Write a protein that binds this ligand. Structure first.
Ligand SMILES: Nc1nc2c(ncn2[C@@H]2O[C@H](COP(=O)(O)OP(=O)(O)OP(=O)(O)O)[C@@H](O)[C@H]2O)c(=O)[nH]1
Ligand SMILES: [Mg+2]
Ligand SMILES: [Mg+2]
Ligand SMILES: [Mg+2]
Ligand SMILES: [Mg+2]
Ligand SMILES: [Mg+2]
Ligand SMILES: [Mg+2]
Ligand SMILES: [Mg+2]
Ligand SMILES: [Mg+2]
Ligand SMILES: [Mg+2]
Ligand SMILES: [Mg+2]
Lengths: 115, 435, 212, 51
RNA sequence: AUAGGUUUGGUCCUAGCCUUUCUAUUAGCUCUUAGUAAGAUUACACAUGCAAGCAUCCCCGUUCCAGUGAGUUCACCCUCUAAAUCACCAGAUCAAAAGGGACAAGCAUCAAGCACGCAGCAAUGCAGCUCAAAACGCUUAGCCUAGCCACACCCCCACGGGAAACAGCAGUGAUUAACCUUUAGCAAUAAACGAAAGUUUAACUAAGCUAUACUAACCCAGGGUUGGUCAAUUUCGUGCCAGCCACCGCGGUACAC
């Protein structure tokens, strides 16, 4: 398909089955379907904890660097994943969501104490 | 096979019972002002907007009286043909308003309506209409009704007689007051909870909404998602609508509601019962179809045993055809099951078999379709459409295939055309008469 | 494979291009507005809620320049949004104007000027973006020097920042594997990455145009 | 809002620095594979062996 | 194929047909539960609802996604080089148009096509080019499936005309043997927009229906067959009749109805 415009993006294509999300990190042309063609698969992400209580994430760091150099964008979930991995700085929204959770927890703690 | 049918719930307890609005069916003789009276009560003028000025459909309307009460008026066809429609209206009615023209007095259809009212065991209110015109003799009307057992109050008869003039809208207020009084005396109530019970008043196929049935609720509230079963058909209620087409959230008892989502078109007058779920509804439908199949199988076994005994008698002792000119094959297409049934009853009244046979190849509800044209071609028949459309493509195909599609909008016009065709097939004018 | 011309397709493409060019809508038509419904009549599209007060209160660049000789060429114009956002002076030094004469009051068109943002000028004059916007204000001839008075703060710009933890570890491990004995901290340079606020005017010359 | 805006500014500055580093690495790798001592030596060695 | 039945009075060989195996659709009879996958027969016509916004106005998007298979060697490799991303740049990535090569099935009772080539700056000159190693032609078919090509109501196209368009989701009429909800949510991923918190999304996610399939289970089992190929029939009723058979065949007082 002769795609008018568009650009590469490193994003999480969703696979798995119902109630069992699983992600393939794909450097795919942004306009292509989420589960459609992709230039290269750069790793994986299992959101459901395994028996060891781990959320396995595979990152082909060399290829991710290559595609960032070639100009691929980064979807927000992938940016957050890289921030967690430490490959990138913690996302501002990761930090701000942590702060919001702390404030909500403090409010609920105050409510619980006032009982 | 275990009996998995769905059966009307037993009469509700007085604690469950709750006041419900009355259903009044306006019945009478042709052109005696039933629809005009209904128009006056509804505050809307439809008598002018009619094909042939004839009511050919048992129509329901939820009128609201100025006092604030609500009444479900069923305006029924007055012609001789629609006996089944009149009987069904009498069955579903709580009260029967018999409209009799003061000018013309009692008539054959008036007597038929009185008989149906007696059979349904429903109170009768006489509305003597056309009182304005000279020779209007309500006293004569009452005296003649004495013969048919509709005794007025003046003669010590429980039936209330009301002189009205639907044309001038005079005395209709007192007619409505009498209707309200009779409803109060009847003290109509029904359970507004639990599985729904209703009656199909009409069925049809709408090109946008599917198989649509105009029903009247009898017990419990109907809502989107309820699973209904009626006769051999079932639905998951997809859209409930009113006479105006406005979607309505709930259908309380004695309300006329058009229901969509029927997987098959039910027959007019059949009972609608709510069931638990789709699998249960399909089980009920399969059981009912199986029962009908067993009945038909018993009858077919009788016929087949006749044939086999004949053949065995024949044997033990020893030890395509071109259709005649005097055979009119007809396809029948109606806008509603009621019209289809009326035409079929008219056909079944046929008695001129010797001179020319009248074969009913197929009948249905909806626009003349390619399959109808194919049947007509296969049997050199004629398609008769009652208030249905014949698209341009269908017309072209019928012209190519030599079929004759005859659309009509009046029952007696269609019957005149049918008798014309029978006479044409004859070797002269036909001897069968519709009435 | 023997081709079959798409002659009607090409002809229609050409005719559509010609029609668009010859019926090109005027700027006064494109950027018109209704001050009751707050919708551009030409397209019928509503303006964002956050622009309603500005549309109802402040004025457009050409709507102002219509009252200035030579359209105030050489004057200094500033935007209400800039005034509310930055304490430092920000303005355009008007250098050229191409009004939309078709406009009733010549209250639309294009402008070119030299940008001063955060007290920093721009080397060359370029087109003014957001001319049609409703957040423009005019700098009176007097008070001009006082308003443009400004002295730069010390040039606060970090030379380098720590690498993300995993990247730092990877670089350190690569150095050790190569055998480098350096204990120097690896720092990612940020001087070349000159951050520029989001409200910094964009290159209008490359901006597109509406259609209808 | 203000803390978030500052966080975005710093985050995007650092991310752009990282992206520039990766772009430089990609350019260096391609120019290497194209005309680096290794590739040029191998090409000339192949030509000499062919002769 | 590890083969088997069937030509005849009998044997051998050749050969066709059929049986046994595995899928998928439909139908008949029958059905309890849970997880998951998949789901109009049709490029025929469509009521209704929704499916594209974002945003300090300009821009950007609505060309994407989703859909269908009508058409059909625009899909693959190489050359060249547009558009787009890499904050501006850089060549890098991606990939149009153009050129070269490759690229479905059947019919030769489709054998000739009828200008289908070349040279020259041009003028103009030469009379050539394809083809039984299948040109030209007709019919059929979406393909080479991380997906790709084509179409977007028809007139290939779409200025224009015919006319008023679901081959977007749900749904419907017609049609076929073929027939799922006119559910909820943006909570996740993706896309659009924004500087951003964020907003929109019938993409998608999570649900609804369906023995179409796989997995798992229940202390509530039907369907088919029972002459040989082929596992497995007692007694009656019928008597070349009723009827049965995938093939051979059975039934004239039956392990075949
Ligand atoms: N003289 C007179 N005519 C009336 C009166 N009311 C109605 N009509 C007319 O009588 C005729 C019959 O009225 P309709 O309602 O059409 O007849 P109908 O009795 O319902 O008969 P169907 O067609 O079988 O339904 C029409 O022309 C009416 O306008 C009345 O009070 N007096
Ligand atoms: Mg009437
Ligand atoms: Mg089945
Ligand atoms: Mg095809
Ligand atoms: Mg031939
Ligand atoms: Mg087209
Ligand atoms: Mg269509
Ligand atoms: Mg659809
Ligand atoms: Mg249908
Ligand atoms: Mg199916
Ligand atoms: Mg026997």
């Amino acid at each position: 398909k002769a795609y008018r415009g568009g650009h590469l993006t490193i994003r999480l294509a969703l696979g798995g089955c119902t109630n069992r999300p699983f992600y393939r990190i794909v450097a795919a042309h942004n306009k292509c379907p989420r589960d459609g063609r992709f230039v290269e698969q750069l790793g994986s992400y299992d959101p459901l904890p395994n028996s060891h209580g781990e959320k396995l994430v595979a990152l082909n760091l060399d290829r991710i660097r290559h595609w960032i150099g070639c100009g691929a964008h980064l979807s927000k979930p992938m940016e957050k994943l890289l921030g967690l991995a430490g490959f990138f700085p913690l996302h501002p929204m990761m930090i701000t969501n942590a702060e919001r959770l702390r404030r909500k927890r403090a409010r609920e703690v105050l409510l619980a104490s006032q009982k | 096979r275990k009996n998995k049918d769905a059966v009307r719930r037993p009469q509700a307890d007085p604690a469950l019972l709750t006041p419900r609005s009355p259903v009044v069916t306006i019945m009478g003789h042709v052109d005696h002002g039933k629809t005009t009276l209904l128009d006056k009560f509804r505050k809307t003028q439809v008598a002018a907007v009619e094909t042939g000025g004839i009511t050919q459909h048992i129509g329901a309307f939820l009128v609201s009286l100025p006092s604030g009460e609500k009444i479900t008026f069923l305006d029924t066809p007055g012609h001789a043909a629609f006996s089944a429609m009149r009987a069904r209206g009498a069955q579903v009615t709580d009260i029967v308003v018999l409209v009799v023209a003061a000018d013309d007095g009692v008539m054959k259809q008036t007597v038929e309506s009185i008989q149906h009212a007696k059979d349904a065991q429903v109170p009768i209110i006489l509305a003597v209409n056309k009182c304005d015109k000279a020779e209007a003799d309500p006293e004569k009307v009452k005296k003649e009704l004495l013969a048919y057992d509709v005794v007025c109050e003046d003669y010590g008869g429980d039936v209330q007689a009301v002189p009205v003039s639907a044309l001038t809208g005079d005395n209709l207020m007192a007619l409505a007051e009498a209707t309200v009084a009779l409803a109060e005396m009847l003290e109509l109530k029904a359970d507004p909870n639990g599985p729904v019970e209703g009656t199909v008043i009409e069925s049809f196929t709408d090109k946008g909404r599917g198989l649509v049935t105009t029903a009247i609720i009898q017990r419990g509230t109907l809502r989107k998602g309820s699973v209904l079963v009626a006769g051999k058909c079932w639905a998951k209620v997809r859209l409930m609508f009113d006479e105006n087409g406005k979607t309505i959230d709930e259908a309380y008892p004695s309300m006329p509601v058009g229901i969509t989502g029927w997987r098959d078109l039910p027959s007019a007058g059949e009972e609608i019962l709510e069931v638990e779920s789709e699998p249960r509804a399909r089980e009920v439908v399969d059981w009912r179809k199986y029962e009908q199949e067993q009945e038909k199988g018993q009858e077919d076994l009788k016929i087949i045993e006749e044939k086999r005994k004949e053949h065995k008698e024949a044997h033990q002792k020893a030890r395509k055809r071109e259709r005649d000119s005097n055979v009119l094959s007809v396809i029948i297409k109606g806008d509603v099951d009621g019209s289809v049934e009326a035409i079929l009853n008219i056909i079944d009244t046929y008695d001129a078999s010797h001179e020319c046979e009248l074969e009913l190849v197929h009948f249905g509800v909806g626009d003349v379709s390619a399959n109808d044209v194919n049947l007509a071609e296969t049997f050199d028949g004629v398609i008769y459409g009652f208030n249905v459309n014949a698209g341009n493509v269908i017309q072209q195909s019928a012209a190519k295939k030599g079929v004759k599609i005859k659309l009509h909008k009046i029952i007696y016009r269609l019957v005149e055309d049918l008798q014309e065709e029978l006479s044409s097939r004859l070797p002269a004018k036909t001897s069968w008469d519709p009435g | 494979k023997k081709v079959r011309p798409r002659l009607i397709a090409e002809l229609a493409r050409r005719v559509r291009a010609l029609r668009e060019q010859l019926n090109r809508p005027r700027d006064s038509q494109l950027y018109a507005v209704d001050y009751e419904t707050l919708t551009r009549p030409f397209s019928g599209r509503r303006l964002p809620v956050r622009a309603w007060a500005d549309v109802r209160r402040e004025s457009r660049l050409l709507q102002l320049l219509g009252r200035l000789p030579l359209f105030g060429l050489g004057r200094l114009v500033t935007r209400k949004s800039w005034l509310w956002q930055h304490d430092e002076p920000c303005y355009w030094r008007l250098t050229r104007v191409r009004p939309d004469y078709t406009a009733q009051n010549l209250d639309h068109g294009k402008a070119w000027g030299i940008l001063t943002f955060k007290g920093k000028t721009e080397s060359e004059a370029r087109e003014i973006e957001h001319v049609m916007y409703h957040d423009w204000r005019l700098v009176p001839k007097h008070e001009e020097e006082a308003f443009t008075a400004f002295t730069p703060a010390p040039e606060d710009s970090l030379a380098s920042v720590p690498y993300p933890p995993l990247l730092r570890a990877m670089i350190i491990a690569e150095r050790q594997k190569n055998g480098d004995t350096s204990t120097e901290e690896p720092m990612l340079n940020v001087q070349r990455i000159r951050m520029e606020p989001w409200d910094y005017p964009a290159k209008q010359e490359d901006k597109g145009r509406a259609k209808g | 809002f203000f803390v978030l805006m500052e966080r975005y500014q710093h985050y995007r500055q650092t991310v752009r620095a990282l992206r520039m580093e990766f772009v430089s690495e990609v350019q260096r790798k391609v120019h290497e594979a194209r005309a680096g001592v290794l590739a040029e030596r191998k090409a000339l060695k192949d030509a000499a062996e062919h002769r």
